[PDB]
Amino acid sequence: QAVEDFSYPGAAKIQAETGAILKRGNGHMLMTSCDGSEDIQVMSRTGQKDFCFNVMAKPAYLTLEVPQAYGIWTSADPVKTTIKDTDGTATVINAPANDFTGYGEAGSTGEPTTLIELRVA
Amino acid sequence: EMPQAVEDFSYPGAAKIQAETGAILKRGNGHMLMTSCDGSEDIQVMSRTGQKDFCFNVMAKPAYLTLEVPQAYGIWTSADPVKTTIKDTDGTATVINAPANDFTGYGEAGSTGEPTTLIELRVA
Amino acid sequence: ARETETANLETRTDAAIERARSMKSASETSITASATTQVEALALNDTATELAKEASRPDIDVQATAAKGRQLAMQAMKLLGPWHQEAAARALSGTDQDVLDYLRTRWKEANHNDIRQQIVDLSTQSPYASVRTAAAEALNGTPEQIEAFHTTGQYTAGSDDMKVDVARLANTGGPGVSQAAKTALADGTGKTLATFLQIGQYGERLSDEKVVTARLAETGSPEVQAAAKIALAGPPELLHEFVT
Amino acid sequence: PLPANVRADIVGYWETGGAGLKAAAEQALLGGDEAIRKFLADAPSIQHD
Numbered sequence A: 001q002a003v004e005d006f007s008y009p010g011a012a013k014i015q016a017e018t019g020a021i022l023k024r025g026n027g028h029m030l031m032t033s034c035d036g037s038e039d040i041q042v043m044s045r046t047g048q049k050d051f052c053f054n055v056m057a058k059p060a061y062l063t064l065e066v067p068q069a070y071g072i073w074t075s076a077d078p079v080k081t082t083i084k085d086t087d088g089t090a091t092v093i094n095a096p097a098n099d100f101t102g103y104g105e106a107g108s109t110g111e112p113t114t115l116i117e118l119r120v121a
Numbered sequence B: 001e002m003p004q005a006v007e008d009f010s011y012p013g014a015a016k017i018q019a020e021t022g023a024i025l026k027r028g029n030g031h032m033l034m035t036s037c038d039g040s041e042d043i044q045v046m047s048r049t050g051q052k053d054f055c056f057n058v059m060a061k062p063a064y065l066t067l068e069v070p071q072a073y074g075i076w077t078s079a080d081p082v083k084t085t086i087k088d089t090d091g092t093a094t095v096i097n098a099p100a101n102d103f104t105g106y107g108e109a110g111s112t113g114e115p116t117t118l119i120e121l122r123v124a
Numbered sequence C: 001a002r003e004t005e006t007a008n009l010e011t012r013t014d015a016a017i018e019r020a021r022s023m024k025s026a027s028e029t030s031i032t033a034s035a036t037t038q039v040e041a042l043a044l045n046d047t048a049t050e051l052a053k054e055a056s057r058p059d060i061d062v063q064a065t066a067a068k069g070r071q072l073a074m075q076a077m078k079l080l081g082p083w084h085q086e087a088a089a090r091a092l093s094g095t096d097q098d099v100l101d102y103l104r105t106r107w108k109e110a111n112h113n114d115i116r117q118q119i120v121d122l123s124t125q126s127p128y129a130s131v132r133t134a135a136a137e138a139l140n141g142t143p144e145q146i147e148a149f150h151t152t153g154q155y156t157a158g159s160d161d162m163k164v165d166v167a168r169l170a171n172t173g174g175p176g177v178s179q180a181a182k183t184a185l186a187d188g189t190g191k192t193l194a195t196f197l198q199i200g201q202y203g204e205r206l207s208d209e210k211v212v213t214a215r216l217a218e219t220g221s222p223e224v225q226a227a228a229k230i231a232l233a234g235p236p237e238l239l240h241e242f243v244t
Numbered sequence D: 001p002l003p004a005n006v007r008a009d010i011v012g013y014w015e016t017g018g019a020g021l022k023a024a025a026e027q028a029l030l031g032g033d034e035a036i037r038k039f040l041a042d043a044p045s046i047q048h049d
Helices: A011-017 B014-020 C002-056 C064-079 C082-092 C096-125 C129-139 C143-157 C159-170 C175-187 C190-219 C222-233 C236-243 D006-016 D019-030 D033-046
Strands: A029-032 A040-044 A050-055 A060-062 A069-073 A079-084 A090-095 A100-102 A114-120 B032-035 B043-047 B053-058 B063-065 B072-076 B082-087 B093-098 B103-105 B117-123
Touching: A029 A060, A040 A114, A069 A079, A069 C159, A100 C159, B032 B063, B043 B117, B072 B082, B072 C190, B103 C190, C002 C064, C002 C096, C002 C222, C002 C236, C064 C082, C064 C096, C064 D019, C082 C096, C082 D006, C096 C129, C096 C143, C129 C143, C129 C159, C143 C159, C143 C190, C159 C175, C159 C190, C175 C190, C190 C222, C190 C236, C222 C236, D006 D019, D006 D033, D019 D033
Parallel strands: none
Antiparallel strands: A029 A050, A040 A050, A040 A069, A060 A114, A069 A100, A079 A090, A079 A114, B032 B053, B043 B053, B043 B072, B063 B117, B072 B103, B082 B093, B082 B117
């Protein structure tokens, strides 16, 4: 059936190729390459090390999961990021536009946290 | 073909200084020279750019040199009052009168915290 | 009483500035001399390469080569480490044909032995577990693998750990350190990251520290004042200790 | 004639001797047999200096 379920298209292939997995979103965030088209960039020590996302419209969100994430680059927009610790506790970090911030591992706690939700203002 | 031997008051070697120290110089009355910092200190300028710092020597008074040094934060004086003009990021310029034989700061390490630029260094 | 305290503070401070002045100059002199020695050592290796080519050149001359080779060995015993010192002494104590051989092969062997030397050092000294392990593996491989690790492999192996360390500095150091860390991180090259963490970040903290001290020197309390001015006047070591 | 290991002994002096003997050793080590004979002839006096 040609019905939109808001499940990330091609997520099955991405899991196999990049190691990252994706779930549900509002459809305005796409995974792409990091080659002169950078928008929101995520850096971890797993999978294929890194990958970029492109914002099609605002507001937007995509509940992707990236284990052992350590930092994010932003551009032309504030980014709201939710991460979770190994004890199941989640917290929210607000990253400013056009700058770099870190997570647990490269943050203040040193914890190997997981990316739970990436949201566009 | 040979150039005219006329003094235009343009700082000699300024082109090489820009390449080596990162500082740039323009016009002055010729009585201030850029030199090394090695026991010959007179007026010293500290910044977070270029080669970190450099010294100037006064040949005669009064003297001035309209040099430009981005992101300056501190100045040392010796045996003379120093009149310094700095400019903010909004284009507004102000003047700080530094006492002899002492140390003063600029915006960045001063009262405003602003990353100001050195515009003019003048000898009393 | 207040005037007396001020006068006494100023007197002591001025004396301290002059002493601090002297120490800074002395430090710079030693640094320059050290850098000069390193340059000569590097130049010596380039000279050895050219001599190695001539000696083995099929059409050799007459002891002329050995004479130059003996001079090379003499310099090696002054500028280079133990691996070259031993090879050089052996060549110098022998005949022209041994100096012939020294230039052709063991000069190169001495360099190889030194490289293997630091592969061994990395296996225990490196802060990165991936580098320590990979170095230990490279050590037991072929000569090519030993040198390959030294040249690029150690930067690749520790790449993941270095990126984390740089990211940390980016979000805690001052303007200088943060500015530089972000640049190194954005680039991502293992060599770039290593350069910043090994030496680059140290130049940057000194910059950040001078700004902090400069402020205290002007807007702080009297005794703080004096201490800050002395710290600026003296060597980097005094600046660091003052701020901390 | 010189000892087969005469150069080795001179290197020894170069490593442990004073400035005089060391400099003299360099001439013997860099030069030929004549430089060695000259060094050995003077070495007993150079050490004294």
